[PDB]
Amino acid sequence: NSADFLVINKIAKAIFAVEGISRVQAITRPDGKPIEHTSIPFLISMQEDSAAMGEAFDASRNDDSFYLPPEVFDNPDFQRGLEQFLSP
Amino acid sequence: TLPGYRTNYNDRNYLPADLPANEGYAAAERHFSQARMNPEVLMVESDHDMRNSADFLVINKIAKAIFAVEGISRVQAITRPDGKPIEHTSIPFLISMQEDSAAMGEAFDASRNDDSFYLPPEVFDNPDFQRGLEQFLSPDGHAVRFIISHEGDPMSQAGIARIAKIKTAAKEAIKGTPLEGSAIYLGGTA
Amino acid sequence: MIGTLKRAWIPLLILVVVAIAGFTVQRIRTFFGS
Amino acid sequence: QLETVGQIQAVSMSPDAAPSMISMKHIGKVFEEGDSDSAAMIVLEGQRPLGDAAHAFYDQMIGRLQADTTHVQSLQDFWGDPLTATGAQSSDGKAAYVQVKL
């Protein structure tokens, strides 16, 4: 659910913050890189400004905020990766 | 008595306090601190022009990560031109009944919240920004530098142990970012 | 043969000490900078 | 005399292989402000908050300092610039400084 995936991203970031650690890989971070279109300029959604903000937050993998709306669990292109990281 | 021997590198502790250099040291300690006149400079040199809104997020990340070291005060960067974060950059300004949102934004500026930061890309063509952009970024934009101050004595045993911590913080701030693998240089007195 | 080695034991000991010290010194000369 | 030659042929305090010396040289090279590791701080302190007379004197002083190309290699203004001026000033406003590379 969207509520517990926030804690999962929190755990992923907290592990990534250990000193000798590189490339933590989680469901909220499927290639060691955060999922795009999840930073704070995409929970917010003259639009050439907000698009520039969002695409500047995706070119650096900002990772200061994260939602993943609850329509990702019924997306078929998400289940094959959801089975790798979460128990059946 | 030998396993209690502590040394010191502050040369102004072993000189008469009536030297002009020490007089100005005292004049500065009356107003800022004793570590304001001995700053460290950290430079992160990448392989691309970092004068864009995408890389300034990583620059602010490095600045915050260095500021988070224990004995560090007054980190000064382009995203933080006076050791204080730039106003109108916190999260209530990326969001933009308006008397509520203005109060939120001006409450986020009275504390220097520093939980979010954008700097829209129309700051690079602003003439009132280039004179400060030349101080902190290389003339070709490939390097950015941060001016770091200590809290107590820079030349103590703690201020010398802080150098490795500053370098580690700078290296961990760019981990997992497009600036990863950049060269980190730290100069100064400590 | 012992009869002639225990006649030049001082130069041999000096050579051993100089060798050990020189190797340890050229080893320590590489710790700085790195 | 011995002391004359000693002060003539003085050697740097830090080695060339020192990481901090390499760092300072590279920082000066990349930012194009001198290949030295020496730097001074001109502090100007007043009994009352520094105003416009102090700013005019400071502008004239840094103009003078930049002219001496043989000794003064560079300087970080940080106080004639309104964006960064508060970084080179005390909280009470009675002192300001500028770093000069030598």
Coordinates of all heavy atoms in Angstrom, one line a residue, chain D:
Chain D
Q1 N 75.9 37.7 6.2 CA 75.8 36.9 7.4 C 74.8 35.7 7.2 O 74.1 35.6 6.2 CB 75.3 37.8 8.6 CG 76.4 38.7 9.1 CD 77.6 37.9 9.6 OE1 77.5 37.1 10.6 NE2 78.7 38.0 8.9
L2 N 74.8 34.8 8.2 CA 74.0 33.6 8.0 C 72.5 33.9 7.9 O 71.8 33.2 7.2 CB 74.3 32.6 9.2 CG 73.9 31.2 9.1 CD1 74.9 30.4 8.3 CD2 73.7 30.6 10.5
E3 N 72.1 34.8 8.7 CA 70.6 35.1 8.8 C 70.1 35.8 7.5 O 69.0 35.5 7.0 CB 70.3 36.0 9.9 CG 70.4 35.3 11.3 CD 71.8 35.2 11.8 OE1 72.7 35.6 11.1 OE2 72.0 34.6 12.9
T4 N 71.0 36.6 6.8 CA 70.6 37.1 5.5 C 70.4 36.1 4.5 O 69.3 36.0 3.9 CB 71.7 38.1 5.0 OG1 71.9 39.2 5.9 CG2 71.4 38.6 3.7
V5 N 71.3 35.1 4.4 CA 71.1 34.0 3.4 C 69.9 33.2 3.9 O 69.2 32.6 3.0 CB 72.4 33.2 3.3 CG1 72.3 32.2 2.1 CG2 73.6 34.1 3.2
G6 N 69.7 33.0 5.2 CA 68.6 32.2 5.6 C 67.3 32.8 5.3 O 66.3 32.0 4.9
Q7 N 67.1 34.1 5.3 CA 65.9 34.7 5.0 C 65.7 34.9 3.4 O 64.6 35.0 2.9 CB 65.7 36.1 5.6 CG 66.6 37.2 5.1 CD 65.8 38.1 4.1 OE1 64.6 38.3 4.3 NE2 66.5 38.7 3.2
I8 N 66.9 34.9 2.7 CA 66.8 34.9 1.3 C 66.3 33.6 0.8 O 65.3 33.5 0.0 CB 68.2 35.2 0.7 CG1 68.6 36.7 0.8 CG2 68.3 34.8 -0.8 CD1 70.0 37.0 0.5
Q9 N 66.9 32.5 1.1 CA 66.6 31.2 0.6 C 65.7 30.4 1.6 O 66.0 29.3 2.0 CB 67.9 30.4 0.3 CG 68.9 31.1 -0.6 CD 70.1 30.2 -0.8 OE1 70.1 29.1 -0.5 NE2 71.1 30.9 -1.3
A10 N 64.5 31.0 1.8 CA 63.5 30.4 2.7 C 62.7 29.4 1.8 O 62.5 29.5 0.6 CB 62.6 31.4 3.3
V11 N 62.3 28.3 2.5 CA 61.6 27.2 1.8 C 60.2 27.2 2.3 O 59.9 27.6 3.4 CB 62.3 25.9 2.0 CG1 62.2 25.4 3.5 CG2 61.7 24.8 1.1
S12 N 59.2 26.7 1.5 CA 57.8 26.6 1.9 C 57.7 25.8 3.2 O 58.4 24.8 3.4 CB 57.0 26.0 0.8 OG 57.0 26.9 -0.3
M13 N 56.6 26.1 3.9 CA 56.3 25.3 5.1 C 55.8 23.9 4.8 O 56.2 22.9 5.5 CB 55.3 26.0 6.0 CG 54.9 25.3 7.2 SD 53.5 26.1 8.1 CE 53.8 27.8 7.8
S14 N 55.0 23.8 3.8 CA 54.4 22.5 3.5 C 55.0 21.9 2.3 O 55.5 22.6 1.4 CB 52.9 22.6 3.3 OG 52.7 23.4 2.1
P15 N 55.1 20.5 2.2 CA 55.7 19.9 1.0 C 54.8 20.1 -0.2 O 53.7 20.5 -0.2 CB 55.7 18.4 1.4 CG 55.4 18.4 2.9 CD 54.6 19.6 3.2
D16 N 55.5 19.8 -1.4 CA 54.7 19.9 -2.6 C 53.8 18.7 -2.8 O 52.7 18.8 -3.5 CB 55.7 19.9 -3.8 CG 56.2 21.3 -4.1 OD1 56.4 22.1 -3.1 OD2 56.5 21.6 -5.3
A17 N 54.0 17.6 -2.1 CA 53.2 16.4 -2.1 C 52.1 16.4 -1.1 O 51.3 15.4 -1.0 CB 54.0 15.1 -2.0
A18 N 52.0 17.5 -0.3 CA 50.9 17.6 0.7 C 49.6 17.7 0.0 O 49.4 18.5 -0.9 CB 51.1 18.8 1.6
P19 N 48.6 16.8 0.4 CA 47.3 16.9 -0.3 C 46.7 18.3 -0.2 O 46.0 18.7 -1.1 CB 46.5 15.9 0.5 CG 47.5 14.9 0.9 CD 48.7 15.6 1.2
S20 N 46.9 19.0 0.9 CA 46.3 20.3 1.0 C 47.0 21.3 0.1 O 46.3 22.3 -0.4 CB 46.3 20.8 2.5 OG 46.7 22.2 2.6
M21 N 48.3 21.2 -0.1 CA 49.0 22.1 -1.0 C 48.6 21.9 -2.4 O 48.3 22.8 -3.1 CB 50.5 21.9 -0.8 CG 51.3 22.4 -1.9 SD 51.2 24.2 -2.2 CE 52.0 24.8 -0.8
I22 N 48.5 20.6 -2.8 CA 48.0 20.3 -4.1 C 46.5 20.8 -4.3 O 46.2 21.4 -5.3 CB 48.0 18.7 -4.3 CG1 49.4 18.2 -4.3 CG2 47.3 18.4 -5.6 CD1 49.5 16.7 -4.2
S23 N 45.7 20.7 -3.2 CA 44.4 21.2 -3.3 C 44.3 22.7 -3.5 O 43.5 23.2 -4.3 CB 43.6 20.7 -2.0 OG 43.5 19.3 -2.0
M24 N 45.1 23.4 -2.7 CA 45.1 24.9 -2.8 C 45.6 25.3 -4.2 O 45.0 26.2 -4.8 CB 45.9 25.5 -1.7 CG 45.1 25.6 -0.4 SD 43.6 26.5 -0.6 CE 44.2 28.2 -1.1
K25 N 46.6 24.7 -4.7 CA 47.1 25.0 -6.0 C 46.1 24.8 -7.1 O 45.9 25.6 -8.0 CB 48.4 24.3 -6.3 CG 49.7 24.9 -5.8 CD 50.9 24.1 -6.2 CE 50.7 22.6 -6.0 NZ 51.9 21.8 -6.2
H26 N 45.4 23.6 -7.0 CA 44.4 23.3 -8.0 C 43.2 24.2 -7.9 O 42.7 24.6 -9.0 CB 44.0 21.8 -7.9 CG 43.3 21.3 -9.1 ND1 43.8 21.4 -10.3 CD2 42.2 20.6 -9.2 CE1 43.0 20.9 -11.2 NE2 42.0 20.3 -10.5
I27 N 42.8 24.6 -6.7 CA 41.7 25.5 -6.6 C 42.0 26.9 -7.2 O 41.2 27.5 -7.9 CB 41.3 25.6 -5.1 CG1 40.7 24.3 -4.6 CG2 40.4 26.8 -4.9 CD1 40.6 24.2 -3.1
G28 N 43.3 27.4 -6.9 CA 43.7 28.6 -7.5 C 43.8 28.5 -9.0 O 43.5 29.5 -9.7
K29 N 44.2 27.4 -9.5 CA 44.4 27.3 -11.0 C 43.0 27.2 -11.7 O 42.8 27.9 -12.7 CB 45.2 26.0 -11.3 CG 45.7 25.9 -12.7 CD 45.8 24.5 -13.2 CE 44.5 23.8 -13.4 NZ 43.8 24.5 -14.6
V30 N 42.1 26.4 -11.1 CA 40.8 26.3 -11.8 C 40.0 27.6 -11.7 O 39.4 28.0 -12.7 CB 40.0 25.1 -11.1 CG1 38.5 25.2 -11.5 CG2 40.6 23.8 -11.5
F31 N 40.0 28.2 -10.6 CA 39.3 29.5 -10.4 C 40.1 30.7 -10.9 O 39.7 31.8 -10.8 CB 38.9 29.7 -9.0 CG 37.6 28.9 -8.6 CD1 37.8 27.5 -8.3 CD2 36.4 29.4 -8.6 CE1 36.7 26.8 -8.0 CE2 35.3 28.7 -8.3 CZ 35.4 27.3 -8.0
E32 N 41.4 30.5 -11.3 CA 42.2 31.5 -12.0 C 42.5 32.7 -11.0 O 42.2 33.8 -11.3 CB 41.6 32.0 -13.3 CG 41.2 30.8 -14.2 CD 40.5 31.3 -15.5 OE1 40.0 32.5 -15.5 OE2 40.5 30.6 -16.5
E33 N 43.0 32.3 -9.9 CA 43.3 33.4 -8.9 C 44.6 33.2 -8.2 O 44.8 33.5 -7.0 CB 42.2 33.5 -7.9 CG 41.7 32.1 -7.3 CD 40.5 32.2 -6.4 OE1 39.7 33.2 -6.7 OE2 40.3 31.4 -5.5
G34 N 45.6 32.6 -8.9 CA 46.9 32.5 -8.3 C 47.2 31.0 -7.9 O 46.4 30.3 -7.5
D35 N 48.5 30.7 -8.0 CA 49.0 29.4 -7.7 C 49.7 29.3 -6.3 O 50.7 28.6 -6.1 CB 49.9 28.9 -8.8 CG 51.1 29.8 -9.0 OD1 51.1 30.9 -8.4 OD2 52.0 29.5 -9.8
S36 N 49.2 30.1 -5.3 CA 49.8 30.2 -4.0 C 48.9 29.5 -3.0 O 47.8 29.0 -3.3 CB 50.0 31.7 -3.6 OG 50.6 31.8 -2.3
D37 N 49.5 29.3 -1.8 CA 48.7 28.9 -0.6 C 48.6 29.9 0.5 O 48.1 29.6 1.5 CB 49.3 27.6 -0.1 CG 50.6 27.8 0.7 OD1 51.4 28.7 0.4 OD2 50.8 27.1 1.8
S38 N 49.1 31.1 0.2 CA 49.2 32.2 1.2 C 48.0 33.1 0.9 O 47.6 33.4 -0.2 CB 50.5 33.0 1.1 OG 50.5 34.1 1.9
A39 N 47.4 33.6 2.0 CA 46.2 34.5 1.9 C 46.1 35.3 3.2 O 46.3 34.8 4.3 CB 44.9 33.7 1.7
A40 N 45.8 36.6 3.1 CA 45.6 37.5 4.2 C 44.1 37.9 4.3 O 43.3 37.6 3.4 CB 46.5 38.7 4.0
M41 N 43.8 38.5 5.4 CA 42.4 39.0 5.7 C 42.5 40.4 6.1 O 43.0 40.7 7.2 CB 41.8 38.1 6.7 CG 41.4 36.7 6.3 SD 39.7 36.7 5.7 CE 39.5 34.9 5.4
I42 N 42.0 41.3 5.3 CA 41.8 42.7 5.7 C 40.5 42.9 6.4 O 39.4 42.9 5.8 CB 42.0 43.7 4.5 CG1 43.4 43.7 4.0 CG2 41.6 45.1 4.9 CD1 43.7 42.6 2.9
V43 N 40.5 43.0 7.7 CA 39.4 43.3 8.5 C 39.3 44.8 8.8 O 40.3 45.4 9.0 CB 39.4 42.5 9.9 CG1 38.1 42.5 10.6 CG2 39.9 41.1 9.6
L44 N 38.1 45.3 8.7 CA 37.8 46.7 9.1 C 36.7 46.8 10.1 O 35.6 46.3 9.8 CB 37.5 47.6 7.8 CG 36.4 47.3 6.9 CD1 35.2 48.1 7.2 CD2 36.8 47.6 5.4
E45 N 37.0 47.3 11.2 CA 36.0 47.3 12.4 C 35.8 48.7 12.9 O 36.7 49.5 12.9 CB 36.7 46.4 13.5 CG 35.7 46.0 14.6 CD 35.7 47.0 15.7 OE1 36.8 47.7 16.0 OE2 34.7 47.2 16.4
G46 N 34.5 48.9 13.2 CA 34.1 50.2 13.6 C 33.3 50.2 14.9 O 32.7 49.2 15.3
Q47 N 33.3 51.4 15.6 CA 32.6 51.5 16.9 C 31.1 51.5 16.7 O 30.3 51.3 17.6 CB 33.0 52.8 17.6 CG 34.5 52.7 18.1 CD 34.7 51.7 19.2 OE1 33.8 51.4 19.9 NE2 35.9 51.1 19.2
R48 N 30.6 51.8 15.4 CA 29.2 51.8 15.1 C 29.1 51.0 13.8 O 30.0 50.8 13.1 CB 28.7 53.3 14.9 CG 29.7 54.2 14.1 CD 29.4 55.6 14.4 NE 30.1 56.5 13.5 CZ 31.4 56.9 13.8 NH1 32.0 56.5 14.9 NH2 32.0 57.7 13.0
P49 N 27.8 50.6 13.5 CA 27.6 49.8 12.3 C 28.2 50.4 11.0 O 28.0 51.6 10.8 CB 26.1 49.6 12.2 CG 25.7 49.6 13.7 CD 26.6 50.6 14.4
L50 N 28.8 49.6 10.2 CA 29.5 50.1 9.0 C 28.4 50.6 8.0 O 27.5 49.8 7.7 CB 30.4 49.0 8.4 CG 31.4 48.5 9.3 CD1 32.0 47.2 8.8 CD2 32.5 49.5 9.6
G51 N 28.5 51.8 7.5 CA 27.6 52.4 6.6 C 28.0 52.6 5.2 O 28.7 51.7 4.6
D52 N 27.8 53.7 4.6 CA 28.1 54.0 3.3 C 29.5 54.6 3.1 O 30.2 54.3 2.1 CB 27.1 54.9 2.6 CG 25.7 54.4 2.6 OD1 25.6 53.1 2.6 OD2 24.8 55.2 2.6
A53 N 30.0 55.3 4.1 CA 31.4 55.8 4.1 C 32.4 54.6 4.2 O 33.4 54.6 3.5 CB 31.6 56.7 5.3
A54 N 32.1 53.6 5.0 CA 32.9 52.4 5.1 C 32.9 51.7 3.7 O 33.9 51.2 3.3 CB 32.4 51.5 6.2
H55 N 31.7 51.7 3.1 CA 31.6 51.0 1.8 C 32.4 51.7 0.7 O 33.1 51.1 -0.1 CB 30.2 50.9 1.3 CG 29.5 49.6 1.9 ND1 28.8 49.6 3.1 CD2 29.3 48.4 1.3 CE1 28.3 48.4 3.3 NE2 28.6 47.7 2.2
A56 N 32.4 53.0 0.7 CA 33.2 53.8 -0.2 C 34.7 53.6 0.0 O 35.4 53.4 -0.9 CB 32.8 55.3 -0.2
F57 N 35.1 53.7 1.3 CA 36.5 53.4 1.6 C 36.9 52.0 1.2 O 38.0 51.8 0.7 CB 36.8 53.7 3.1 CG 38.0 53.1 3.6 CD1 39.2 53.7 3.2 CD2 38.0 52.0 4.4 CE1 40.4 53.1 3.6 CE2 39.2 51.5 4.8 CZ 40.4 52.0 4.5
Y58 N 36.0 51.0 1.4 CA 36.3 49.7 1.1 C 36.5 49.5 -0.4 O 37.4 48.7 -0.9 CB 35.2 48.8 1.7 CG 35.2 47.3 1.2 CD1 36.0 46.4 1.8 CD2 34.4 46.9 0.1 CE1 36.0 45.1 1.3 CE2 34.4 45.6 -0.4 CZ 35.2 44.7 0.3 OH 35.2 43.4 -0.2
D59 N 35.6 50.1 -1.2 CA 35.7 50.0 -2.7 C 37.0 50.6 -3.1 O 37.7 50.0 -4.0 CB 34.5 50.7 -3.3 CG 33.2 50.0 -3.1 OD1 33.2 48.8 -2.9 OD2 32.2 50.7 -3.1
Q60 N 37.4 51.8 -2.6 CA 38.6 52.4 -3.0 C 39.8 51.6 -2.6 O 40.8 51.5 -3.3 CB 38.7 53.8 -2.4 CG 39.7 54.8 -3.1 CD 41.1 54.6 -2.5 OE1 41.3 54.3 -1.3 NE2 42.1 54.9 -3.3
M61 N 39.7 50.9 -1.4 CA 40.8 50.1 -0.9 C 41.0 48.9 -1.7 O 42.2 48.5 -2.0 CB 40.6 49.8 0.6 CG 41.7 48.9 1.2 SD 41.2 48.2 2.8 CE 39.9 47.1 2.2
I62 N 39.9 48.2 -2.1 CA 40.1 47.0 -3.0 C 40.5 47.4 -4.4 O 41.3 46.6 -5.0 CB 38.8 46.2 -3.0 CG1 37.7 46.9 -3.7 CG2 38.4 45.8 -1.6 CD1 36.4 46.1 -3.8
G63 N 40.1 48.6 -4.8 CA 40.7 49.1 -6.1 C 42.2 49.3 -6.0 O 42.9 48.9 -7.0
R64 N 42.6 49.8 -4.9 CA 44.1 50.0 -4.7 C 44.8 48.6 -4.6 O 45.8 48.4 -5.2 CB 44.4 50.8 -3.4 CG 44.0 52.2 -3.5 CD 44.7 53.0 -2.4 NE 43.8 53.3 -1.3 CZ 43.8 52.7 -0.1 NH1 44.8 51.8 0.1 NH2 43.0 53.0 0.8
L65 N 44.2 47.7 -3.9 CA 44.8 46.4 -3.7 C 44.9 45.6 -4.9 O 45.9 44.9 -5.2 CB 44.0 45.6 -2.6 CG 44.3 45.9 -1.2 CD1 43.2 45.4 -0.3 CD2 45.6 45.3 -0.7
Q66 N 43.9 45.6 -5.8 CA 44.0 44.9 -7.0 C 45.0 45.4 -8.0 O 45.5 44.6 -8.9 CB 42.6 44.9 -7.7 CG 41.5 44.2 -6.9 CD 40.2 44.2 -7.7 OE1 39.2 44.6 -7.1 NE2 40.2 43.7 -8.9
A67 N 45.4 46.7 -7.9 CA 46.4 47.2 -8.8 C 47.8 46.6 -8.6 O 48.5 46.5 -9.5 CB 46.4 48.8 -8.6
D68 N 48.1 46.3 -7.3 CA 49.5 45.8 -7.0 C 49.5 44.3 -7.5 O 49.4 43.4 -6.7 CB 49.7 45.9 -5.5 CG 51.1 45.5 -5.2 OD1 52.1 45.7 -6.0 OD2 51.3 45.0 -4.0
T69 N 49.8 44.2 -8.8 CA 49.7 42.9 -9.4 C 50.8 41.9 -9.0 O 50.7 40.7 -9.0 CB 49.7 43.0 -11.0 OG1 48.7 44.0 -11.3 CG2 49.5 41.7 -11.7
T70 N 51.9 42.5 -8.5 CA 53.1 41.6 -8.2 C 52.9 40.9 -6.9 O 53.4 39.8 -6.7 CB 54.3 42.5 -8.1 OG1 54.2 43.5 -7.1 CG2 54.6 43.1 -9.5
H71 N 52.2 41.5 -5.9 CA 52.0 40.9 -4.6 C 50.6 40.4 -4.4 O 50.4 39.2 -4.0 CB 52.3 41.9 -3.5 CG 53.7 42.5 -3.6 ND1 54.0 43.8 -3.6 CD2 54.9 41.8 -3.5 CE1 55.3 44.0 -3.7 NE2 55.9 42.8 -3.6
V72 N 49.6 41.2 -4.7 CA 48.2 40.8 -4.6 C 47.8 40.0 -5.8 O 47.7 40.6 -6.9 CB 47.3 42.0 -4.3 CG1 45.8 41.6 -4.5 CG2 47.5 42.6 -3.0
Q73 N 47.5 38.7 -5.7 CA 47.2 37.9 -6.8 C 45.7 38.0 -7.1 O 45.2 37.9 -8.3 CB 47.6 36.5 -6.6 CG 49.1 36.3 -6.6 CD 49.5 34.9 -7.1 OE1 49.3 33.9 -6.5 NE2 50.1 34.9 -8.3
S74 N 44.8 38.1 -6.0 CA 43.4 38.0 -6.2 C 42.8 38.4 -4.9 O 43.5 38.6 -3.9 CB 42.9 36.6 -6.6 OG 41.5 36.5 -6.4
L75 N 41.5 38.6 -4.9 CA 40.7 38.8 -3.6 C 39.2 38.5 -3.9 O 38.7 38.7 -5.0 CB 40.9 40.2 -3.1 CG 40.5 41.4 -4.0 CD1 39.1 41.8 -3.9 CD2 41.4 42.6 -3.7
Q76 N 38.6 37.9 -2.8 CA 37.2 37.6 -2.9 C 36.4 38.8 -2.2 O 36.4 38.9 -1.0 CB 36.9 36.3 -2.1 CG 37.5 35.1 -2.8 CD 37.4 33.9 -1.9 OE1 36.7 33.9 -0.9 NE2 38.2 32.8 -2.2
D77 N 35.7 39.5 -3.1 CA 35.0 40.7 -2.6 C 34.0 40.4 -1.5 O 34.2 40.8 -0.3 CB 34.4 41.5 -3.7 CG 34.3 43.0 -3.5 OD1 34.3 43.4 -2.3 OD2 34.2 43.7 -4.5
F78 N 32.9 39.8 -1.9 CA 31.9 39.3 -1.0 C 31.2 40.4 -0.1 O 30.4 40.1 0.7 CB 32.5 38.2 -0.1 CG 32.5 36.9 -0.7 CD1 33.3 35.9 -0.1 CD2 31.9 36.6 -1.9 CE1 33.4 34.6 -0.7 CE2 32.0 35.4 -2.5 CZ 32.7 34.4 -1.9
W79 N 31.6 41.6 -0.3 CA 31.0 42.7 0.4 C 30.6 43.9 -0.4 O 29.6 44.6 0.0 CB 32.0 43.2 1.5 CG 31.3 43.9 2.6 CD1 30.2 43.5 3.4 CD2 31.6 45.2 3.2 NE1 29.9 44.4 4.3 CE2 30.7 45.5 4.2 CE3 32.6 46.2 2.9 CZ2 30.8 46.6 5.0 CZ3 32.6 47.3 3.6 CH2 31.7 47.6 4.7
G80 N 31.2 44.1 -1.6 CA 30.6 45.0 -2.6 C 29.5 44.4 -3.4 O 29.0 45.1 -4.3
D81 N 29.1 43.2 -3.1 CA 28.1 42.5 -3.8 C 26.9 42.4 -2.9 O 27.0 41.7 -1.8 CB 28.5 41.1 -4.3 CG 27.6 40.5 -5.3 OD1 27.2 41.2 -6.3 OD2 27.3 39.3 -5.1
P82 N 25.7 42.9 -3.2 CA 24.6 42.9 -2.3 C 24.1 41.5 -2.1 O 23.5 41.2 -1.0 CB 23.5 43.7 -3.0 CG 24.2 44.5 -4.1 CD 25.4 43.7 -4.5
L83 N 24.3 40.5 -3.0 CA 23.9 39.1 -2.8 C 24.7 38.4 -1.7 O 24.1 37.6 -1.0 CB 24.0 38.4 -4.1 CG 23.8 36.9 -4.1 CD1 22.3 36.5 -4.1 CD2 24.5 36.2 -5.2
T84 N 25.9 38.7 -1.6 CA 26.8 38.1 -0.6 C 27.3 39.0 0.5 O 28.1 38.5 1.3 CB 28.0 37.5 -1.4 OG1 28.6 38.5 -2.2 CG2 27.6 36.3 -2.2
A85 N 26.9 40.2 0.6 CA 27.4 41.2 1.5 C 27.3 40.7 2.9 O 28.2 40.9 3.8 CB 26.8 42.5 1.3
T86 N 26.2 40.1 3.3 CA 26.0 39.6 4.7 C 26.9 38.5 5.0 O 27.0 38.2 6.2 CB 24.5 39.3 4.9 OG1 24.1 38.4 3.8 CG2 23.7 40.5 4.9
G87 N 27.5 37.8 4.1 CA 28.5 36.8 4.4 C 29.8 37.3 4.8 O 30.6 36.6 5.5
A88 N 30.1 38.6 4.5 CA 31.3 39.2 4.9 C 31.1 40.3 5.9 O 31.7 41.4 5.9 CB 32.1 39.8 3.7
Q89 N 30.1 40.1 6.8 CA 29.7 41.1 7.8 C 29.3 40.4 9.1 O 28.7 39.3 9.0 CB 28.7 42.0 7.3 CG 28.7 43.4 7.9 CD 27.6 44.3 7.3 OE1 26.7 43.9 6.6 NE2 27.7 45.6 7.6
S90 N 29.5 41.0 10.2 CA 29.1 40.5 11.5 C 27.6 40.6 11.6 O 26.9 41.3 10.9 CB 29.8 41.2 12.6 OG 30.9 41.9 12.2
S91 N 27.0 39.9 12.7 CA 25.6 40.0 13.0 C 25.3 41.4 13.5 O 24.2 41.8 13.2 CB 25.2 38.9 14.0 OG 25.4 37.6 13.5
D92 N 26.2 42.0 14.2 CA 25.9 43.3 14.7 C 26.2 44.4 13.6 O 25.7 45.5 13.8 CB 26.7 43.6 16.0 CG 28.2 43.5 15.7 OD1 28.7 43.6 14.6 OD2 28.9 43.2 16.7
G93 N 26.9 44.1 12.6 CA 27.2 45.0 11.5 C 28.3 45.9 11.7 O 28.5 46.9 11.0
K94 N 29.1 45.7 12.8 CA 30.2 46.6 13.1 C 31.6 46.1 12.5 O 32.6 46.8 12.7 CB 30.4 46.7 14.6 CG 29.2 47.2 15.3 CD 29.4 47.4 16.8 CE 28.3 48.1 17.5 NZ 28.5 48.2 19.0
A95 N 31.6 45.0 11.8 CA 32.9 44.5 11.3 C 32.6 43.8 9.9 O 31.6 43.2 9.7 CB 33.6 43.5 12.2
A96 N 33.6 44.0 9.0 CA 33.6 43.3 7.7 C 35.0 42.9 7.4 O 36.0 43.4 8.0 CB 33.0 44.2 6.7
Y97 N 35.1 42.0 6.4 CA 36.5 41.5 6.1 C 36.5 41.1 4.6 O 35.4 41.0 4.0 CB 36.9 40.3 6.9 CG 36.1 39.1 6.7 CD1 36.5 38.1 5.8 CD2 34.9 38.9 7.4 CE1 35.8 36.9 5.6 CE2 34.1 37.7 7.2 CZ 34.6 36.8 6.3 OH 33.8 35.6 6.1
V98 N 37.7 41.0 4.0 CA 37.9 40.6 2.7 C 39.2 39.7 2.7 O 40.2 40.1 3.3 CB 37.9 41.7 1.7 CG1 39.0 42.8 2.1 CG2 38.2 41.3 0.3
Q99 N 39.1 38.6 2.0 CA 40.3 37.7 1.9 C 41.1 38.1 0.6 O 40.5 38.3 -0.5 CB 39.9 36.3 1.8 CG 41.0 35.4 1.4 CD 40.6 33.9 1.5 OE1 39.7 33.5 2.2 NE2 41.4 33.0 0.8
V100 N 42.4 38.2 0.7 CA 43.3 38.6 -0.3 C 44.3 37.5 -0.5 O 45.0 37.1 0.5 CB 44.0 39.9 -0.1 CG1 45.0 40.2 -1.1 CG2 42.9 41.0 -0.1
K101 N 44.4 37.0 -1.7 CA 45.4 36.0 -2.0 C 46.7 36.7 -2.4 O 46.7 37.7 -3.1 CB 45.0 35.1 -3.2 CG 44.1 33.9 -2.7 CD 44.1 32.8 -3.8 CE 45.5 32.3 -4.1 NZ 46.2 31.7 -2.9
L102 N 47.8 36.1 -1.9 CA 49.1 36.8 -2.0 C 50.1 36.0 -2.9 O 49.9 34.7 -3.0 CB 49.7 37.0 -0.6 CG 48.8 37.9 0.2 CD1 49.3 38.0 1.7 CD2 48.7 39.2 -0.4

